Amino acid sequence: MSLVIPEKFQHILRVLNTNIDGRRKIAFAITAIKGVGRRYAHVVLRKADIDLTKRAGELTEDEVERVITIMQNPRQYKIPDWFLNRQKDVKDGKYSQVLANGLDNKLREDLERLKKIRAHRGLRHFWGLRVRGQHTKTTGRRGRT
């Protein structure tokens, strides 16, 4: 396809707060933002209607802007409901894909509300212990001394 190079090749992209490596292919390039994995990246570029075989550097800035505005607003552009990251939220009930440092914020506030009501999961998150019912006698010592 591309004979030699695009003349205006953006080597490093800067999308929300993270550096997207422009030498990777586009789906596996934008998977470097939190909240977006391989699966979600592939569906949002299928919805954006860009050719997946081109790398991240030779996308034009309008195409990047389209990819972002359909990444942040997935439900308006027929991303299926069961596909999302934060669906039926415990604070406002609406359905979303947290895709940024906001995902870190959402994880933080979930942890601190469980800690604030002093439920068992919040207590085990407050200590350094395992949460999902594993045995702690033999494994898990790497973080510990």
Binding site: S2, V4, I5, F9, R55, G57, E58
Partner: protein
């Protein structure tokens, strides 16, 4: 020998270095032209298919795990 870390979508210097150096030596595989010029290796596959489309090289094996090319014979 720390990291290779260099190349994709080569410049004009690597392009014409390819066009004058690759199609006349015997073993032409994506691996030997990847380690030969600086090419990444998927770019090498694409470039070798494009050269075969022009017709400067000859296809020999064409397996999914190993594709082998060679220079055109001289007579």
């Amino acid at each position: 020998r720390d990291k290779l870390n260099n190349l994709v979508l080569f410049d004009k210097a690597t392009y014409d270095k390819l066009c004058k150096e690759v199609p006349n030596y015997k073993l032409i595989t994506p691996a030997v032209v990847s380690e030969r010029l600086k090419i990444r290796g998927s770019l090498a596959r694409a470039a070798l298919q494009e050269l075969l489309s022009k017709g400067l090289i000859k296809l020999v094996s064409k397996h999914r795990a190993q594709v082998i090319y060679t220079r055109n014979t001289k007579g």
